[PDB]
Amino acid sequence: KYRKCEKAGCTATCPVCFASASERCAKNGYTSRWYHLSCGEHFCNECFDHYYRSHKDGYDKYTTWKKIWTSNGKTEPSPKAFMADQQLPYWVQCTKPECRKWRQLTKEIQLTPQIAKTYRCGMKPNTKPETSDHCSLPEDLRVLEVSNHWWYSMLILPPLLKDSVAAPLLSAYYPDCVGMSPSCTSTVHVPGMNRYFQPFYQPNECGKALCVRPDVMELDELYEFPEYSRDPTMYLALRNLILALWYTNCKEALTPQKCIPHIIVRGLVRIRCVQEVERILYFMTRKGLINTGVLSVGADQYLLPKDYHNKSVIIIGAGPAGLAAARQLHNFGIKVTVLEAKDRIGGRVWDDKSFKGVTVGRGAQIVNGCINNPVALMCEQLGISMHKFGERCDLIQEGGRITDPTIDKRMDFHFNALLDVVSEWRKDKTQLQDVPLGEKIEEIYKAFIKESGIQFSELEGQVLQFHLSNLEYACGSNLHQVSARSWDHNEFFAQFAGDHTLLTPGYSVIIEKLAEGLDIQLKSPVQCIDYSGDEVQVTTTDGTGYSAQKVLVTVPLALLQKGAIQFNPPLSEKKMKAINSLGAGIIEKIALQFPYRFWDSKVQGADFFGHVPPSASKRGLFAVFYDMDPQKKHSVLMSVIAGEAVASVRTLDDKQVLQQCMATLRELFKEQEVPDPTKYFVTRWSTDPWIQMAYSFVKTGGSGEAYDIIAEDIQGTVFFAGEATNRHFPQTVTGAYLSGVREASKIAAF
Ligand SMILES: Cc1cc2nc3c(=O)[nH]c(=O)nc-3n(C[C@H](O)[C@H](O)[C@H](O)COP(=O)(O)OP(=O)(O)OC[C@H]3O[C@@H](n4cnc5c(N)ncnc54)[C@H](O)[C@@H]3O)c2cc1C
Ligand SMILES: [Zn+2]
Ligand SMILES: [Zn+2]
Ligand SMILES: [Zn+2]
Numbered sequence: 001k002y003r004k005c006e007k008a009g010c011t012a013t014c015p016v017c018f019a020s021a022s023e024r025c026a027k028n029g030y031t032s033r034w035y036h037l038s039c040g041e042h043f044c045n046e047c048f049d050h051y052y053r054s055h056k057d058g059y060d061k062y063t064t065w066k067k068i069w070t071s072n073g074k075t076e077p078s079p080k081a082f083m084a085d086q087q088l089p090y091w092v093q094c095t096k097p098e099c100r101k102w103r104q105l106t107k108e109i110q111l112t113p114q115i116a117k118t119y120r121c122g123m124k125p126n127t128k129p130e131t132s133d134h135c136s137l138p139e140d141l142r143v144l145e146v147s148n149h150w151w152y153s154m155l156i157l158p159p160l161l162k163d164s165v166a167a168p169l170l171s172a173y174y175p176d177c178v179g180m181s182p183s184c185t186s187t188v189h190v191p192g193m194n195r196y197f198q199p200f201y202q203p204n205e206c207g208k209a210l211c212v213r214p215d216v217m218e219l220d221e222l223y224e225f226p227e228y229s230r231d232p233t234m235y236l237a238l239r240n241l242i243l244a245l246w247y248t249n250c251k252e253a254l255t256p257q258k259c260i261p262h263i264i265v266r267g268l269v270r271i272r273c274v275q276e277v278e279r280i281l282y283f284m285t286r287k288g289l290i291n292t293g294v295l296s297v298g299a300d301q302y303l304l305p306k307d308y309h310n311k312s313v314i315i316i317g318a319g320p321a322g323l324a325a326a327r328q329l330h331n332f333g334i335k336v337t338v339l340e341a342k343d344r345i346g347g348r349v350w351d352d353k354s355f356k357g358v359t360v361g362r363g364a365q366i367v368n369g370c371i372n373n374p375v376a377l378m379c380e381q382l383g384i385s386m387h388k389f390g391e392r393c394d395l396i397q398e399g400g401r402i403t404d405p406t407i408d409k410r411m412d413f414h415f416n417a418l419l420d421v422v423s424e425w426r427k428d429k430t431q432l433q434d435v436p437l438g439e440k441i442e443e444i445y446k447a448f449i450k451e452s453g454i455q456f457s458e459l460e461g462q463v464l465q466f467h468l469s470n471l472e473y474a475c476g477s478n479l480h481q482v483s484a485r486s487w488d489h490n491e492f493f494a495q496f497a498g499d500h501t502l503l504t505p506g507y508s509v510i511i512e513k514l515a516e517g518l519d520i521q522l523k524s525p526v527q528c529i530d531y532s533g534d535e536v537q538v539t540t541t542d543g544t545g546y547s548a549q550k551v552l553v554t555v556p557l558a559l560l561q562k563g564a565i566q567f568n569p570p571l572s573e574k575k576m577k578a579i580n581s582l583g584a585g586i587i588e589k590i591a592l593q594f595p596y597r598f599w600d601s602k603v604q605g606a607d608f609f610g611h612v613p614p615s616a617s618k619r620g621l622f623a624v625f626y627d628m629d630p631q632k633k634h635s636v637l638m639s640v641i642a643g644e645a646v647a648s649v650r651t652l653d654d655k656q657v658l659q660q661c662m663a664t665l666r667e668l669f670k671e672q673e674v675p676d677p678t679k680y681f682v683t684r685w686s687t688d689p690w691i692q693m694a695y696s697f698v699k700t701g702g703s704g705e706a707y708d709i710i711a712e713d714i715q716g717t718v719f720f721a722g723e724a725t726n727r728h729f730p731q732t733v734t735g736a737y738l739s740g741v742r743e744a745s746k747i748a749a750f
Helices: 044-053 061-070 079-087 113-118 143-145 149-153 219-224 233-248 256-262 270-289 322-331 374-382 405-426 438-452 458-475 507-515 557-561 572-583 643-647 655-668 705-711 731-748
Strands: 034-038 043-044 091-093 103-104 312-316 335-339 367-368 499-501 526-530 536-540 545-548 550-553 567-568 583-584 588-593 607-609 621-627 636-641 678-680 695-698 719-720
Touching: 034 044, 043 044, 044 061, 044 079, 061 079, 091 113, 091 270, 091 507, 113 256, 219 270, 233 256, 233 270, 256 270, 270 731, 312 322, 312 536, 312 583, 322 335, 322 507, 335 545, 335 550, 367 731, 374 621, 374 731, 405 438, 405 458, 458 655, 499 621, 507 526, 536 550, 550 731, 557 572, 557 583, 572 583, 572 705, 583 705, 588 655, 607 655, 621 655, 636 643, 636 655, 655 678, 719 731
Parallel strands: 312 335, 312 550, 526 567, 550 719
Antiparallel strands: 034 043, 091 103, 367 499, 526 536, 536 545, 583 695, 588 636, 588 678, 607 621, 621 636
């Protein structure tokens, strides 16, 4: 007794039963109720009853299904859910480029990714027609409707994907909560021996960098796609599938064409899903979640639609951030020029390649926490290996004695309790009450000695000094410059989990790949940035002018501080306050080649050894020596000068620094002979005019917020990236890289 849909504002002139399950099916006629799934998809009450009522013959099928559904999912197992999960026909799009018509498949045909890839109109049960005349039959008029605004509004139930590539990573979630089907027999990390790809948080898991909640839409996602606010399921299913596809093949661009065949769901909704996967892809690409790293893009090929292509950008600095942003923008199809002061790219990445059998970094060479680390992604993309550091680091004393592990551990413990008293002391203190971390530590240690009567030996004091110099190394400063309140501010945010590694082939392999074929001008030090006009006007020191709509600054913090780039309009007081609130931390490195591996019998394959400092005054003077060949075949050691020791070396030439280091080595290996080095370098980052630092840290009275402030764009035309702009991940090549990706996403938007 009804031929119109049950639902208000349904646009279906003629509801038709897709089910035809009952002999008594209402077909294209009247029923007591026309059950709505979509504007183009209904079933009659007779067919409803065919499954739902215990006396009808479709009851076994429904009840069986409902059991599976209930034991696997958290969604109500209605007849509608059953119809959409098990009964609706599959729709597939003709892959002939001149055709592209969507076709409904006959009730019995099971869609597979192979059908999706090869489909042409008129393809019968077994997969290609004689002529392509089947293509000329008009498209069901329902197809055109799917892409309406009000069509999605009238979906009563969300799509649930079958055999999602994401499934194996979402075992811990209810499939439906994550946009997958509770009935697919399908019911951790992405496949790989390194295990570095862990894109999803486990249920209620936090504290792991770059993980995404597979069951929740973030704010940046709801803002881009607000149509999903009532039910995120569809977005989540497609975003999750997209992440899983990207990580299973990170070496090629992930396109809609690659995703289409992996979206298996019944009904007209599959069309909506196919039409959305494109938009979601573009969002995620822009954001740098996929289609990123050192992805090789064709000259003609661009990752974003021509819509984004009417922008030009000057990027200042060809370090990791500058190159990350340049690669992204260039891949997007945006016109980018990189201006670099030095005669090379890389910035604080600078690899020496002249030592036989190893590559040794003058700057960065460690990766701290490889899980979800873009550096590990780019390593994967390049098929290069990293070396995970071993645990063992003997503290050798001058004279040759190896410190007892219990002393090392006891004084490591006490070092950490000192840090805990500091974090106790500071919780209530304001910025204006900040005290140098070094002062706080010395104070606390004194009060501990005093009101406990505990007294440490000389050796114990010296081991404590070793652990102290590690923090100085980590901060890139003597602790008397470092904020007690804020030194580890970034630790508040999820950090990168997993391996700490030596990047054996060096960061330069990554840096060079990122830079490949980009418009990079070397020895083009920027002196002036003028954005007061319609275009940004950039002028190098020699006077060459460049203009673009947008400028990205990635110069080291020390260079901003020294005001090497004139900004007009000048930077805000707020920005300058932030800039000066951060310290330009410094370490220097020494590499030493020896005729043979003299240290092997004492060190026994460890990746590094420590140098117990003879005094507080010497503590950062070559505290750790790194065996630069994890293959244990070549003989190159590297060491580090940190803390007050960096100042001490400023007046020494390379040979004296070398002699100092050899004297150290001779003392550590006092009982034996140490051969002279055949080759070395000593770095001088602090007097390198375009760098003048190693990495930022928060000065006394500073805040981690300074990192966000430096990162804030001006007027949507001047953008900042770099290590010193990454609040979550300061200091590292990783953080620098991600800052550049961050800015390209900002720049590519509007
Ligand atoms: C000795 C040392 C050891 C380190 N150890 C590690 C490590 O193990 N792991 C790790 O992750 N990080 C390490 N770091 C830090 C890491 O190298 C930096 O955080 C990272 O290189 C910063 O990248 P960036 O793009 O922000 O800046 P940079 O790498 O400093 O690049 C900025 C570019 O800006 C250019 N520039 C400056 N002024 C101008 C101008 N006026 N015009 C044009 N160009 C200009 C510079 O020449 C430079 O090439 C180390 C650094 C040093 C120095
Ligand atoms: Zn029916
Ligand atoms: Zn309807
Ligand atoms: Zn066709």
